[PDB]
Amino acid sequence: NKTVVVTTILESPYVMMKKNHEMLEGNERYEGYCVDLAAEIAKHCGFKYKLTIVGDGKYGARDADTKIWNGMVGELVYGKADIAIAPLTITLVREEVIDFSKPFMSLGISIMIKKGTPIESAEDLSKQTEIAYGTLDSGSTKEFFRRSKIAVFDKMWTYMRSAEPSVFVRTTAEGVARVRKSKGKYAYLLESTMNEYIEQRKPCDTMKVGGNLDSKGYGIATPKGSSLGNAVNLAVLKLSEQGLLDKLKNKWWYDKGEC
Ligand SMILES: NS(=O)(=O)c1cc2c(cc1Cl)N[C@H]([C@H]1C[C@H]3C=C[C@@H]1C3)NS2(=O)=O
Ligand SMILES: N[C@@H](CCC(=O)O)C(=O)O
Ligand SMILES: [Zn+2]
What we know:
Strand content: 15-25%
Distance between the termini: 46 Å
Radius of gyration: 18 Å
Strand order of the largest sheet: 9-10-8-11
Largest sheet: 4 strands, mixed
Name: Glutamine Receptor 2
Organism: Rattus norvegicus
Assembly: monomeric
PDB class: membrane protein
CATH architecture of the largest domain: 3-Layer(aba) Sandwich
Gene: GluR-2
Number of helices: 10
CATH class of the largest domain: Alpha Beta
Number of domains: 2
Bound molecules: cyclothiazide, glutamic acid, zinc ion
CATH superfamily of the largest domain: Periplasmic binding protein-like II
């Protein structure tokens, strides 16, 4: 019996620092959907755990050339963490190196715009040039475009990869701030979950437009062949069927809505 090392990321409303975290210790310093989920997964699987924020603040991508994985995926692949409980997207390239539980939350790539922006779809973005658009560095959303075969998406990637100054951002907050401060000249491509969350946060000046570009979900990840895999997957199913996952999404997304 050993304390499970949990890697996660500071991303609202999944994991956030508590107001007086400086006066708290260990897992008590954090709050959010994934903090709540972590406690439940651990309780049902019967293990003690320690939440740790991923060092490089990234989700996970493999550097072409160096072939080294960064972010939470990296912490799992190189043995720094035993499990990842965060808004980590299930993708083929990742499932080839780590294991994923069935999804605990659904999402799709979506468009965030400053209210009033002349955009209603991805096709709209790909057909104009006045409004710039980008995605998060090191994420599944960037990969989606980099490897998309679909016309509208291949065209969009071609623009984004060559846009100057860079249309990519280091963090979701950076993307959101760019939308809010660009007077409608910047649209941000991000997962519906984050988009929906920000839409219910003051100043209530952003909006999700159009339908989602794809359909996927977040899963709890473990190193390939881990002993925790089975139990965690069963826990996710149990918690999903008992309605806890829905309860947690409402608690962190809409129950505390500010708009
Ligand atoms: N509506 S939501 O995003 O909070 C949400 C999304 C999903 C849930 C449960 C909730 Cl509450 N459960 C499923 C899980 C239950 C089983 C059927 C599909 C997987 C395994 N995942 S999902 O379809 O990605
Ligand atoms: N959830 C994504 C990060 C957010 C994004 O790429 O938009 C991932 O696991 O890479
Ligand atoms: Zn429970």
